[PDB]
Each structure stands twice: as C-alpha cells, then as structure tokens.
Amino acid sequence: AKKVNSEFLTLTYGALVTQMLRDFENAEDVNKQLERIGYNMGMRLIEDFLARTSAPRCLEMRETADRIQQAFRIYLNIQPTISNWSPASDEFSLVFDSNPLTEFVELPPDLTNLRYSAILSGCIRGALEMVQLEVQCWFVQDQLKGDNVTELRVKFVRRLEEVIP
C-alpha cells in the first residue's frame, strides 16, 4: 500500500491528452494546449518550489540546472542528471530514465508529432519566467517517440529584466 501516492497524476494526464486529441485532431494543437497549460502549472509550482527550496534566485545556468533538477526530485520524485552543457553554458540536458509522468501511456499510438513531455516544457518555461529567465524549452530525445532516454533541452535565450518601476 502506497508506494506512490501520486500515480494518480499520470492517469489524469493521459485522460487530458486523449480528451484533447479527440477534440483537436492535430498533434500540433494539443501541443500548444500542453505547452500553455504547463505554463500556467509551472507558474503555480515555481512559487512553492521557492517556498521550500528557498533559493536566492538564478543568476547562473549551473544554478538553474541544480534548482530545476531539485524541483524534479521534490515534485515528480525523479532524479534528472544534468549533462551536455553548452560551450556557452546555455544548453544542458536532463536525463530521465523513466519519465515519471508516463507509465506506458502508449508506445505506439500511431502518432508522431504527439509529444508528451510538452507539459514539462510548459511548466519549466512558466516557472522560469516567474523568476525572470526567458529560456526556450524542447526535447532532444524522448523514449516514447522511439528513444531509450527522454531528454529535455533548454538553452539560455535571454535574461529578462524588471523594468518600468
């Protein structure tokens, strides 16, 4: 009893993905819904992550990597391992052996372009812009699409700054 309290979440997510996918025929449309809904979710989650980890704020991508992988530790109980840094330290890679949020959602649904981790991408970006870090997010490798490890990618695009006092 209760190895995982929140295995509930992944099934809810599967419900949402199939509900949209029935609603909107295109993998692209649901991609935008996943991204924006991750955006709002990550906006919700980053403040709690900073209430617990109580980080100063991220002024350096090594710090950003440690912070977000710590959040994965504390939110999805996963241990992504930072790797593949940019020479300019913009890119780094998060090694998910098991995408926690999927437990054989479907290996073939007969649908490429349907990317699952887009919810993570939305969460990471919305979180980051709460802390004034506009970084784009995508997924270099993804088990479901035929890979062996699911690998998120983020590259430091711009340093947002508070303005207009």
Binding site: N5, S6, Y13, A15, Q19, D23, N40, R44, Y75, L76
Partner: peptide, 27 residues
C-alpha cells in the same frame, strides 16, 4: 505531491469549452 494535482484540477476547473459541460470521460 498533492500540489501537482491541486493545480491541474484547478486549471480544469478553468477551461470548460462550450461543446459539452463535462468533456471529462471516466477513464
């Protein structure tokens, strides 16, 4: 771990498209 589900169900409370009230199937 609850915070994920509270936020996610919250955002479901947010969007309800006018086609059906509860698009939520029971799977």
């Amino acid at each position: 771990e609850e915070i994920l589900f509270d936020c996610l169900h919250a955002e479901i409370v947010n969007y309800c498209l006018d086609s059906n009230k509860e698009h939520d199937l029971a799977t």
